Design a protein around this ligand. Sequence first.
Ligand SMILES: *[C@@H]1O[C@H](CO)[C@@H](O)[C@H](O)[C@H]1NC(C)=O
Ligand SMILES: N[C@@H]1C[C@H](O)[C@H](O)[C@@H]1O
Ligand SMILES: [Zn+2]
Length: 1016
Amino acid sequence: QCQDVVQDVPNVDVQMLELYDRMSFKDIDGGVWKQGWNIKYDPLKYNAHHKLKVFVVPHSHNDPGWIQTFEEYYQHDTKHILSNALRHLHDNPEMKFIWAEISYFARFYHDLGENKKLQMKSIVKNGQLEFVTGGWVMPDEANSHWRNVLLQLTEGQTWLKQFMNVTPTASWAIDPFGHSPTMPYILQKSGFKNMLIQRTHYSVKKELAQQRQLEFLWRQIWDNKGDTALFTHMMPFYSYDIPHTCGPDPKVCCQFDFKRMGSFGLSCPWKVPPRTISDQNVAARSDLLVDQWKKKAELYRTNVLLIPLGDDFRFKQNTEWDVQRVNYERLFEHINSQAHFNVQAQFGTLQEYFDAVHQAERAGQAEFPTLSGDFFTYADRSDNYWSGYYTSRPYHKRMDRVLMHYVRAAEMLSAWHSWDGMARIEERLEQARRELSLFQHHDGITGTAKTHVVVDYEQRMQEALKACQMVMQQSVYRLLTKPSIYSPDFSFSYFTLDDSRWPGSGVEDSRTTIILGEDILPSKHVVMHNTLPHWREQLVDFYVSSPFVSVTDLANNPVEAQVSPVWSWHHDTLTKTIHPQGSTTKYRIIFKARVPPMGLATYVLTISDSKPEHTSYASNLLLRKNPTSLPLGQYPEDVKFGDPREISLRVGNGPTLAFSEQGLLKSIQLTQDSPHVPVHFKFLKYGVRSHGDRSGAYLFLPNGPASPVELGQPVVLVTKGKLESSVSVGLPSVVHQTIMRGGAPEIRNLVDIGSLDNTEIVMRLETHIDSGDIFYTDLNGLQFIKRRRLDKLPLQANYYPIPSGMFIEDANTRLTLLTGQPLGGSSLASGELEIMQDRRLASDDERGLGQGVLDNKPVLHIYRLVLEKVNNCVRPSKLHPAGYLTSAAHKASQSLLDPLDKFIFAENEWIGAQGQFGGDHPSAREDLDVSVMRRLTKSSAKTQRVGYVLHRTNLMQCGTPEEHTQKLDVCHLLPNVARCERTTLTFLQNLEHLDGMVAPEVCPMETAAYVSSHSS
Ligand SMILES: *[C@@H]1O[C@H](CO)[C@@H](O)[C@H](O)[C@H]1NC(C)=O
Ligand SMILES: N[C@@H]1C[C@H](O)[C@H](O)[C@@H]1O
Ligand SMILES: [Zn+2]
């Protein structure tokens, strides 16, 4: 039976929200362990029959971009680290090394001669070089979507299986800025047995260390039974560098970083340098080091101790390999032979550490606590909370979500067929997956890299978008053209993509107008794709060169349509106002597209000489004092003008929205009867401190609560149509738009912070919902976690990642804000929600980036706003740490992240065109998604294989029958199935051979992967 994820509160030893409520977070000086205490141990704890086993694990943290680009670091540092690791591990059989970032390792290995490839394979096979995690990168855990965490994990592990014949089962995450339970969720479903984390709040490290709870079985917050649990090691100290990994006193541990004696340009800030180990000092040196090790061991439950030995881009020079290796070997020889220490120390790997810990556990020497929750928001010291990077470089955060969807759609659309090598499908998909995967790095999507590195990530993602477009349009042409007519040129553009929300109106004028005319071209085919596994209707829009356009399906049935002007906003330097201009040569046509599950639907746009029967025209009202005319070319309705005033709008039988005279929402009425519920949007600004620590790309250090943006008398544009209405207003730094299509409104903000230095712009919602101190935010687009706003912590500590949505509720009412981009946000008072839009910061914030954030560019942020009655919903109890979306909020999120794709046929006539693809595909319940569909074999494989990742969310029961759907069996989506297997989520291991070749659907909050084999 499926676990109930709502009604049983798991019993765990440590529940992070409960721990937060209880903890006092006092920042006291703990002595040499600044954020701890003076650790004491009983020397008689170890003896001949109970020794301390110490694993020193050499490592090198290699950022795939940060202060230099990926390729710059590869040429300057990483290729030398890997070349010298190969040499020194080969020559020194007891030395060990771990490696995390497969993007760099693949970059290196493919440039090796065969002789060196063979030597590399041998030091991996014999266990000297060990891959940890084996993702393409070490990803951010706050802003990343779980689908892209899995994508990058799969990209790295598929490479490693192919070329190194290994699949890591231990994860190493020493640098992401706070940690998410989405990681153990994905890793445990991908064969992992152990993971390690580091950047958790210094007060959490102290609290868990005092209880010896730094090693725990980390389960998901809803998991009563514990089947999601993954053994997790949290490192105890302030950094992963050598001063903070040997033991609690960095002034002592720095003396054991043998790269700091001077010739390498490094030194010890605690003013005592390392000394070369010799026969004359090894006993004293070992005394000092073993005492640090035994203090660190006090914080953990077994007699097996992990000592990382590394730092950023370490193990580069041959002289550095020698100075670390030779000095540690001298220490190990002395320590291991001096019975009075009762220690056995050696170089080891991460897996070796975890294997020895679990051998101790099985021998009955330790029992580990259970834990649920997350580790946000991180602070490394004092009040320095790392909530700034939840928003930094928001243009690229939004681009991540656009590319996420494009990769999914290109892999799915092209998976239906096998393609000849000449089509370059696999090549373009590999490039797209790798550039998106690279951006999941903890200096990519986080917005914490130097300006020229951000430009490199953007250029890579632009090439990845172009790759996706090529694959998608080739696939649409093949899926919708009569097979005996299909005659592809794999370099040709049969369709171009039309995307209404990226980069966005006002960000780039990149959309193509469909040009129709009696003397050039009467009509145009367009095609919509729906990547979701259920039938979808959704309004779509295109630019057209006439307002007199009508739409038909490919059975020539008329489709109701609305035409609206194309409005653009200009900051007018002559009048010093922000106001809209309408085009006099292009127009927007909007209509409802109905598209099969995982399918395609074709429509035709036809010009006529006059208003067509099934096309209506929106009215337009410009509210401002001092108006001037707004001609619209051939558009048949004249614009109307008026002074600023409150206005109300309703589309279809949907909610009625009321707006202030400044163009901002004031209330929502859900039904014709019901109350006008206050829901007010407001824009505010945070500044930066003029004394003490400055906000930068990582840190948010506001100078108090936000202050309202002074709005003046902004110009408001109201467009009212049968199918779509909107209110748009030109505010300082934001063109804010509320769009209504008959259900939950859509909000679009065109955010241009301009030259406003030391400013963070926030969008706040004010309501009467009696939420108190509780609010909910998501983790990686996968789950919603309960937050409690703690007044004992500063403002910036109450900011959390908002990777896809947030909500507040009381007994009767909920307000959910869904996002199309990860941003930071909070609820700083009962009834409020707020989300940061952009931040422009002049100073560096002392974490090594060496710049502020002064490279802002206009970005179009998108949202959905769902106000709902929830008193009839079956919700978790007050003690449950999770929350769950309603059906309407989940569908609104899907509308933002995986919209219909739109294709415009590029030539004048499409011969052989077909009207639909996928009409026979099952329309699966609403809580189930086909997150990934990917063909895993090239055309030369006799047995083709297609992989699917199926995710089922959990939606609240609120009494809507909402029913009859068809079972989805992904293993029968392609014909001639010969086998169906359940696999790990990376597709790399078969877990179950399935009866009747049927892939079962999954339980709420579960994710499974299946591979179908076809003998076609
Ligand atoms: C891959 O490793 C497995 C595990 O022992 C081994 O049996 C197999 O032969 C290896 N494949 C090769 C040799 O590349
Ligand atoms: N350890 C530092 C943090 C910075 O953001 C970059 O990821 C470096 O590795
Ligand atoms: Zn890093």
